[PDB]
Write an enzyme that holds these catalytic residues in place. Sequence first.
Site, mmCIF file in Angstrom:
data_model
loop_
_atom_site.group_PDB
_atom_site.id
_atom_site.type_symbol
_atom_site.label_atom_id
_atom_site.label_comp_id
_atom_site.label_asym_id
_atom_site.label_seq_id
_atom_site.Cartn_x
_atom_site.Cartn_y
_atom_site.Cartn_z
ATOM 1 N N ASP A 1 1.145 -1.193 -0.182
ATOM 2 C CA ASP A 1 -0.258 0.158 0.122
ATOM 3 C C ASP A 1 0.984 1.116 0.413
ATOM 4 O O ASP A 1 2.246 1.544 -0.159
ATOM 5 C CB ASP A 1 -1.195 0.651 0.697
ATOM 6 C CG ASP A 1 -2.011 0.773 0.981
ATOM 7 O OD1 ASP A 1 -3.086 -0.211 0.492
ATOM 8 O OD2 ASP A 1 -2.404 1.627 1.072
ATOM 9 N N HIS B 1 -3.683 6.108 4.244
ATOM 10 C CA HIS B 1 -4.279 4.806 3.586
ATOM 11 C C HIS B 1 -3.267 3.275 4.121
ATOM 12 O O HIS B 1 -4.398 2.649 4.357
ATOM 13 C CB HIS B 1 -4.693 4.714 1.533
ATOM 14 C CG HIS B 1 -4.438 3.301 1.203
ATOM 15 N ND1 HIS B 1 -4.725 2.534 1.559
ATOM 16 C CD2 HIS B 1 -6.518 3.515 1.199
ATOM 17 C CE1 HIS B 1 -6.185 1.754 0.346
ATOM 18 N NE2 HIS B 1 -7.305 2.599 0.409
ATOM 19 N N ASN C 1 -14.290 -0.437 -6.349
ATOM 20 C CA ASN C 1 -14.849 0.206 -5.796
ATOM 21 C C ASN C 1 -15.719 1.366 -6.723
ATOM 22 O O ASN C 1 -16.537 2.643 -6.911
ATOM 23 C CB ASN C 1 -14.406 1.566 -5.183
ATOM 24 C CG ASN C 1 -13.021 1.245 -4.277
ATOM 25 O OD1 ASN C 1 -14.369 0.264 -2.914
ATOM 26 N ND2 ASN C 1 -12.706 1.630 -3.382
ATOM 27 N N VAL D 1 -5.653 -15.984 -6.488
ATOM 28 C CA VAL D 1 -5.980 -15.000 -4.746
ATOM 29 C C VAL D 1 -7.835 -14.799 -4.378
ATOM 30 O O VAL D 1 -8.705 -16.018 -4.823
ATOM 31 C CB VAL D 1 -5.984 -13.951 -4.868
ATOM 32 C CG1 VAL D 1 -4.323 -13.733 -5.671
ATOM 33 C CG2 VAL D 1 -6.542 -13.146 -5.964
ATOM 34 N N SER E 1 -10.706 -1.589 0.066
ATOM 35 C CA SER E 1 -9.230 -1.205 0.268
ATOM 36 C C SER E 1 -9.587 -1.508 1.807
ATOM 37 O O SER E 1 -9.356 -1.942 2.678
ATOM 38 C CB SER E 1 -9.349 -0.140 0.183
ATOM 39 O OG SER E 1 -9.032 0.389 -0.859
#
Length: 279
Positions: A39, A69, A161, A177, A224
């Site tokens: 990140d 974040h 998103n 994943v 996230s």
Amino acid sequence: AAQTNAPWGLARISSTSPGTSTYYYDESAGQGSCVYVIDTGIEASHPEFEGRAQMVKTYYYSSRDGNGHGTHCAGTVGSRTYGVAKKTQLFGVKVLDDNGSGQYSTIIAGMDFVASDKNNRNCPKGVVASLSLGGGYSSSVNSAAARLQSSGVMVAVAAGNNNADARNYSPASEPSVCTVGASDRYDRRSSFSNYGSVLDIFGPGTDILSTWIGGSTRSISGTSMATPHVAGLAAYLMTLGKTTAASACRYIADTANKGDLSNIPFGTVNLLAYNNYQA
Ligand SMILES: [Ca+2]
């Protein structure tokens, strides 16, 4: 263990029902596991991390999280107050700049870094990676996420998103994943959450309180934020011996709350992450 007046998302992942406020979990709390947060970095000095967080790699001039974040995501994985897995080790990999953006080549390098770096860390219970990032479809980005998973890391990735099918985003669209959608406190799919057959699971993603830079805290929303709930849950379950990195996503889906959410289109799983803790 019982943490009263917990963030709603922690309470939700230990409950069969919405509307509760206590987080229940086994006291082992992810000890002996490791989670890489890929990140904007992590503010490791934050007291909420209790010395369990460190920066291990940056692709920019500093390893400092100048955005927040990554610190927020790390906090949901493993901070003492806001975290799912309150004793895990947290490793920050800064692939996103302080504006929150990153080139795909840098993201790919960070994933290959984790696949090797885990051999340099003590994670006897297992290794997880939380990828709260995404962009348009790239087969190279998907293959990097697939390689990381194949190396023996449980990879949790945000669905995105865009209120759209996640098949058109990476690494969300990589099948191997664990692709995570976002839900709200009333058990609705978050309005922004991507959907589709590639999703594996939903986690709490609307109005999530966690750590921020400057030793602070704040609530924010996104897939996230759902992703680190799932990553922390995987670390927690590994430590308990319930699953391994290769099996954790299927285990979480098998043990999830089923049918709780509204506004799931046909072809998308209706499953909400759940720790199944019985004290
Ligand atoms: Ca999958």
